[PDB]
Amino acid sequence: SLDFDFTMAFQPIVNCRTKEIFGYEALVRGLNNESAYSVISRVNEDNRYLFDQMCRVKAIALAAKLGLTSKLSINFLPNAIYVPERCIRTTLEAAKRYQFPIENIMFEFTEAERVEDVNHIKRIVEYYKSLGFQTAIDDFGSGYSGLNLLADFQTNIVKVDMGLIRNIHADQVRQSIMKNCLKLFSDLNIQPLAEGVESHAEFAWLKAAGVELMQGYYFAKPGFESLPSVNPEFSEA
Amino acid sequence: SLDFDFTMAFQPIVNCRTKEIFGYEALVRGLNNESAYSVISRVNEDNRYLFDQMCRVKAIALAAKLGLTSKLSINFLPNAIYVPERCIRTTLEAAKRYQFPIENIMFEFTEAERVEDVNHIKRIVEYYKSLGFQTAIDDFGSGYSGLNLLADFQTNIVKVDMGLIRNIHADQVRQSIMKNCLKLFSDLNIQPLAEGVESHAEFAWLKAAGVELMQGYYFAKPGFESLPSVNPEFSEA
Ligand SMILES: [Ca+2]
Numbered sequence A, B: 001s002l003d004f005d006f007t008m009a010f011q012p013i014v015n016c017r018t019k020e021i022f023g024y025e026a027l028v029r030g031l032n033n034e035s036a037y038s039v040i041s042r043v044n045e046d047n048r049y050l051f052d053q054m055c056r057v058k059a060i061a062l063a064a065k066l067g068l069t070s071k072l073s074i075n076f077l078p079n080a081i082y083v084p085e086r087c088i089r090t091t092l093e094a095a096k097r098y099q100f101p102i103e104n105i106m107f108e109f110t111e112a113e114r115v116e117d118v119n120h121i122k123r124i125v126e127y128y129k130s131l132g133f134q135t136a137i138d139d140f141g142s143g144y145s146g147l148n149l150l151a152d153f154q155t156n157i158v159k160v161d162m163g164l165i166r167n168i169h170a171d172q173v174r175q176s177i178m179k180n181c182l183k184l185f186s187d188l189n190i191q192p193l194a195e196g197v198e199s200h201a202e203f204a205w206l207k208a209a210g211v212e213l214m215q216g217y218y219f220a221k222p223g224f225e226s227l228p229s230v231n232p233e234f235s236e237a
């Protein structure tokens, strides 16, 4: 409760094998403004900390009040430094108030600039794992979110960037990339998640290739302060 | 036509299957008899184009003086130049004047920062190939040099970042990464090049995994204004 305000939207992650919802990603949106960027552009270096925790609190409280019984997935801000061994207390308390299991919370790690050289973000990830949080690398395949990360540590989940997913049913190069990356993920005991799935065509290929977790407009758009139901087109068969 | 001067150094790339030297990478050094990084800092937004051409010509003229008979590999600056596909005049004229065949010249595209309108770096890579140049993606697995690039265009060679290579004989995760990337490169008909090979142990493993082209201290250090000969330990190894 400080400077400016905002809320959350939620977007389903679907298990295409069980046809069940795995969970929802919490996405920042304005009080009525529907743009994530608009809000996050209003935050700066002097207030990144106190904003990051309000995201978590808001997302958890909103999750709980909406009746979320699966996983809650939250983006971890690229401003990766500070001491992890104290900023997590606010998060633990929040989960504890709303009786939301820490093991049902996943943090998504992303990078848009090359900082700290793996070993630091590694320390953040390994820490969260030791408290029982799930962990993910986000946007794998774009930005500084690539193979260098996987090399020194492994998250439970890797979310493959939509750029690698797009039109993959008829893109031989994207098919080879995904086929080999899925082998790599398996060797590393990492679960794949395909994001930005926009069409049945992509879905069916990714499902055949062995991907279970998917996210995207084909399933459901982010719902403002709500948990969207998933497209009956795939849930009926 | 602008300010400060500089020179070049050269480091050989070895082909371990044919036991032949593949060629040399040109590395920027100041007149200051071995000054790297210092030169590259002096470049700014106003002369990133004028400094770009200068490196290429110097590299070709020097290589020519030294009697280089194999490949000459040149780092394309992070496309801060935004080369209109017509200002390649300087390089073409330099190769012609110094009788250095254009097909023996390879350009290395490193940090393709941001989704460079995807096609920007793509157009430029495609344009250089159409002229007969060789092309390489540099530092694969470190910077913005990653899978997103490989998805939309393919170079002749991909230089794998030395971070993925370091102590790979010892590192089972790094091993799976390379085993699955080498299969990928092969699917895409791309020749891999292992950078930063420092020890025999690394060389033996990389060689046994199918890597032919390699570069690093193990073979030879960068030679100031010279073409370093290669440690023949890899002779039969
Ligand atoms: Ca995310």
Ligand SMILES: [Ca+2]
Residues within 6 Å of the ligand: B025, B075, B108, B138
């Ligand atoms: Ca290089």
